[PDB]
Design a protein around this ligand. Structure first.
Ligand SMILES: [Zn+2]
Ligand SMILES: [Zn+2]
Ligand SMILES: [Zn+2]
Ligand SMILES: [Zn+2]
Ligand SMILES: [Zn+2]
Ligand SMILES: [Zn+2]
Ligand SMILES: [Zn+2]
Ligand SMILES: [Zn+2]
Lengths: 62, 63
């Protein structure tokens, strides 16, 4: 069966964190989250491609 | 297209960030990273399941 993730690329782009003393440097976190966002986009695109292919194969077999 | 994935759950665990006098609250960033690590695992399992399912259906169509 299909398994869903918790977050999306847009939710990570738009997440706001509160601040505090000795918090993590914002640019360090944001640059790393940007790499994560691109991975979410890559994962989502490949799943979309694999699920459309899965639907086509199941249709030929029906 | 291809699977040009940049990071792994282990790389996310190992990543360190410099701190500032102020910055993003560490608790909140770390707990968000935990959710992300769990999603990388889910994405992987979903892709593996679809790849093997599609292989099996392709083979059956021709055998
Ligand atoms: Zn499943
Ligand atoms: Zn499946
Ligand atoms: Zn799925
Ligand atoms: Zn930088
Ligand atoms: Zn989509
Ligand atoms: Zn692909
Ligand atoms: Zn270190
Ligand atoms: Zn894999």
């Amino acid at each position: 069966g299909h398994m869903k993730v918790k977050l999306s690329a847009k939710e990570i782009l738009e997440k706001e964190f509160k601040t505090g003393v000795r918090g993590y440097k914002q640019e360090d976190v944001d640059e790393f989250l940007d790499m994560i966002i691109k991975d979410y986009e890559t994962f989502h695109q490949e799943i979309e491609e694999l699920q459309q292919e899965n639907l086509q194969l199941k249709k030929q077999l029906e």
